[PDB]
Amino acid sequence: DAELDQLLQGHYIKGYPKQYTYFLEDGKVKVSRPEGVKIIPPQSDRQKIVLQAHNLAHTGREATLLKIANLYWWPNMRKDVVKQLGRCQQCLITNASNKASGPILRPDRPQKPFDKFFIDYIGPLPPSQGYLYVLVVVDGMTGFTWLYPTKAPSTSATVKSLNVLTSIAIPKVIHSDQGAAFTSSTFAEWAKERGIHLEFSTPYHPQSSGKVERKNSDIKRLLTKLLVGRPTKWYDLLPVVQLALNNTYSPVLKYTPHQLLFGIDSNTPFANQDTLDLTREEELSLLQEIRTSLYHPSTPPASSRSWSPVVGQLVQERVARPASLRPRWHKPSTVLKVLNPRTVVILDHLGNNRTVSIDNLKPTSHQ
Amino acid sequence: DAELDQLLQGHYIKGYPKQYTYFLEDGKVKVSRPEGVKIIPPQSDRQKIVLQAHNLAHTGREATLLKIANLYWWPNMRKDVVKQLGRCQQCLITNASNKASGPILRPDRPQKPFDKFFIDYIGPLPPSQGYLYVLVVVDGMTGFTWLYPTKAPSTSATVKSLNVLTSIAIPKVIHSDQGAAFTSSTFAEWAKERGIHLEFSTPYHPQSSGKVERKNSDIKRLLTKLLVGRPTKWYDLLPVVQLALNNTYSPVLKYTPHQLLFGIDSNTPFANQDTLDLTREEELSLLQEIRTSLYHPSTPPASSRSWSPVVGQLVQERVARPASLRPRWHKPSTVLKVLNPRTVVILDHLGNNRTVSIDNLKPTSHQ
Amino acid sequence: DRPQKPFDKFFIDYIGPLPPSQGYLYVLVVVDGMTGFTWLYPTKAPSTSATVKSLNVLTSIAIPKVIHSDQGAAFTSSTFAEWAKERGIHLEFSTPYHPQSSGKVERKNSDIKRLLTKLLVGRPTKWYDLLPVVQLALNNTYSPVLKYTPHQLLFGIDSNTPFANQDTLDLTREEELSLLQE
Amino acid sequence: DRPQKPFDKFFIDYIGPLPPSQGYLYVLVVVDGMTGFTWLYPTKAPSTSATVKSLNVLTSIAIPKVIHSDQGAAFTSSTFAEWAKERGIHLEFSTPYHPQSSGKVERKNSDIKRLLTKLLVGRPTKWYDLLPVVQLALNNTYSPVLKYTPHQLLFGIDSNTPFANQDTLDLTREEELSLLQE
DNA sequence: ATTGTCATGGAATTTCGCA
DNA sequence: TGCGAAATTCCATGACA
DNA sequence: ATTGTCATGGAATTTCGCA
DNA sequence: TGCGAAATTCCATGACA
Ligand SMILES: O=C(NCc1ccc(F)cc1F)c1c(O)c2c(CO)ccnc2n(O)c1=O
Ligand SMILES: O=C(NCc1ccc(F)cc1F)c1c(O)c2c(CO)ccnc2n(O)c1=O
Ligand SMILES: [Mg+2]
Ligand SMILES: [Mg+2]
Ligand SMILES: [Mg+2]
Ligand SMILES: [Mg+2]
Ligand SMILES: [Zn+2]
Ligand SMILES: [Zn+2]
């Protein structure tokens, strides 16, 4: 009001260009701009004006400004527009992100067999012999896979199947998602009794279990092909598929999961006979070098508009199972630690510490 | 057998390199290759060998060859491998495509309002006043949207709502997907009585209705923001959202759907007053030029490994709702006509003519 | 002075009571003062409730600066006044017993009352279904003064339903006899 | 001659009948002739059916070229012969009453029968749950001849469960008394 | 017989106010 | 005739089941 | 406290057989 | 020392709820 008073008489005020005639009409300070005559509201009224324009349809920066520009003008209008957008809780938790996640990590292949198991459940499937699910256990280094049919993705069925598997060898680490069968205290006690470290993916990020998930695709693809024209009796096919996939060549590796595990084919069709004249000690020596020379992919190029997490940054976790007409994003939270360019710890919306993937995060807009 | 007979004595046969010693051992013709000693099977046995290797895990070109190469060798092995892959019905209908669709078309914006309506249903939603669905009608040229709550995505509810809409004007064409409400003979008769041409998207391709689908996103996004912290009573908000979105600026267009339809704002907040001194005839003249100068996007660049349809080509339509462990692709079919680089007519797997989008097609591998 | 524009002034009035058609008895007539564009809303009473209910549909498409009506009870109520004030609509009333609008609006309301009568005869209880086609006819009628139809002035385009054939708008001799009996 | 390899020859035999543990009475013992690696499968009978059922689990992981056994009924049946022929497995039988395998296999089967006895005492009806840890012990036992454990020869790596502490494998004086009573 | 669309906010580019 | 800053435009990102 | 993966088949590149 | 063709490698595409 006092700022606008000195402007009407002709005195200069920073932000208001001098080459325009500021006059008074109908009790409102106006200005003759190239687009037309606009009302210059006092500083004390500009926040309320930006709010009324935004609240019409909760529009972003430009769509909110085009409304205000129809009637008003003042120095640095978008600055006041963005200020309100960053304070509108409804827009922050409902709008989508326009910044992609940084490029994925390609973690090193486990050095030895049984160094790390990946496990996951497939199902529910068509009922076969009373069974509905399949426990899939993939050795990270070899890709060798064990299949176990179960009636439920339960901890009890998981333990019974893994006790049979661990008859052959005990793994260092078992990696799984945060499903109910693997996060139960009963499963943790089972792993501790056997010296097995339990590793868990970040929530709602099956890419972290991409080792098994990819193997799940091959299992279903083969089961589909074998069941074409037949009723879906898959129970008796699980041993067939397990053997078939474990002895299938990976074209980029030039080896099968069986060969990476044993260094020699068994009495299967088209068994490789190259190491026939070598001794077992010479055969294992060649196997130890084959395992270390395997192809390993590198991190892909980052997309043109990606974001990487920074300690202290305001981020928002995606809502797991959002109800109809409910926001897709939680309220803003702060990054506590950056474990890797793709994984962070945040101060959760409940007050807890949470370890999440950036694929389920967006950086809070407008700072 | 006779071909292999002349090879043992040293005579040259095309395809078999001369610089290798072909000998006989254990009743089988063998050869000393750099990789080792391989069996050369007779021509009459090579098809059965490729089949047994493929059928182990129904593997592609290289994974099937790496099996055969462990024991056998003959001229142009991959040629015989690919020949079997193109005949294996299970692989053709179960495997995924590795060729992306050609770039999308950006069809011209309708020249006038009411030239083309796009319609679609949103729902089911949380029960609000007994209503579960929303009929969304978007004018293609303006983006102006009408909202109608219904108890079901039915033809009867669609007709009752459109009879109210067509009180203001009758459209030339109504475009919709192939939902039950829009494909019923009752709806076709309703449109014919009013001189309205019914246009339908290709099946299972909501991109073709992208005009409404995109508007559906804005409707749900605004309804979400307005319902934050409140129970999802959306029935009384549909008129509010309809008015809010119809008067929202499109930042790339610099106009609202209301302005493109009427050429002048009504008594809404922040109404534009630029054409205040013009007459209505001068205002409509400016509106007629604004409609013709609107920004129109162009077709994006094709991806590095895209495919475009050719008449006579063998393609496969995606299965609509594939059951568990069932193939994702129909049996191969022939392209009859290419309506546009993104739409074709095929001789359907039942014997009918079908108009499909290439997004739901894959070119049959191995010709 | 500023030229007249659409949404500058809406003229509203009630027509009825009419023979019951699917439960409705009245028609709320809304005419835009500049274009002559007409909206017809069937109500069950000439009440503020039915008026607000029907104008909420219209004001979800466009909001007038001014609404003009007579001193009817539904329009002079404090409820309807609060309704108009919330939407920034200025209410403007004609003098009691001195109904005043404009020549274009007067003639437009004449056409509506006459067109309703011509189709009420023979089908007096089916006018609810006919309200859509009645609006199309009224809004695609050529205006002798402006030389443009209401549809053309509101949207700036020609219409997909041009009404070149004009109903007589007068009752034929057989329609007069079947009306004096009703 | 070609050096000996894993999966060249599997030696199978039945141990039992044993005290019932969760319904099972026998243990089908499978030993790889080259590595000494041992698989233990509990069955309810020394029948061809139970043998095929347990070997189907093993042959879904690796298939031997040759299976060696004695002239036991389950192994000389025409059904088990058809089963082996379908998987390309050559059956090889020792002379009746002249059981013959190999020194490494003979000693390995000795360790299994002795290790089972040492844990049968005290818990005679709970050996079903102990079969996993028994296989781990057998397959991580240091071989004096080859100077490598069966696990190391089969996988070419060290194990995450090395068994440095060796059970006495002989029955203590108190275990002998609690066994003569059973 | 048919066909993607567009709000969004950082970044890239242009325009403005002044000299 | 050019500077710093504001204003405008650009456009990758994601979601419409 | 944790992290994508890899079969697939045309295309691009290298190797082979021969001179 | 270089050619045509076969063999190998490359890698974008898509799917694991
Ligand atoms: O969406 C899932 N996969 C789909 C999927 C998507 C991307 C990818 F790169 C790999 C994938 F597999 C998925 C789950 O969402 C899930 C949940 C949560 O519902 C609990 C337990 N297991 C789960 N598995 O196993 C899943 O695969
Ligand atoms: O998947 C649907 N949308 C999702 C969707 C995906 C891509 C896109 F670019 C736009 C989209 F909207 C979808 C349907 O699948 C659908 C079906 C088939 O179930 C019948 C009737 N309507 C339907 N509508 O409206 C849909 O949006
Ligand atoms: Mg899972
Ligand atoms: Mg999974
Ligand atoms: Mg639809
Ligand atoms: Mg839709
Ligand atoms: Zn907002
Ligand atoms: Zn196949």
Author numbering:
A (entry chain A), B (entry chain A): 9 to 375
C (entry chain B), D (entry chain B): 116 to 297
Which statements did the authors publish about this structure?
Compound 5j, which has a hydroxymethyl group at the 5-position, represents a new group of naphthyridine-based INSTIs. Compounds 5j and 5′g are compact and lack the third pharmacophore ring and/or substituents at the 6-position, but both have modifications at 4- and/or 5-position. 5j has a hydroxyl group at the 4-position that could hydrogen bond with a water molecule that is consistently observed in that region (arrow). The hydroxymethyl group at the 5-position could partially displace a water molecule. This, in turn, could potentially allow the compound to make a hydrogen bond with the base of nucleotide dA21, as is observed in the PFV intasome-bound crystal structure. Interaction with the vDNA could explain the ability of this compound to broadly inhibit the resistant variants used in this study. In addition, the crystal structure of the PFV intasome with 5j bound showed two water molecules that form hydrogen bonds with the hydroxyl moieties at the 4- and 5-positions. Modeling suggests that the OH of the 5-hydroxmethyl moiety of 5j may interact with the adenine at the end of the viral DNA. Stacking interactions between the first ring of the central pharmacophore and the adenine base of dA21 should be strengthened by the hydrogen bonding interaction between the hydroxyl moiety and the N7 of adenine. Compound 5j was by far the most broadly effective of the new compounds we tested, suggesting that additional modifications to the 5-position of the naphthyridine scaffold should be explored.
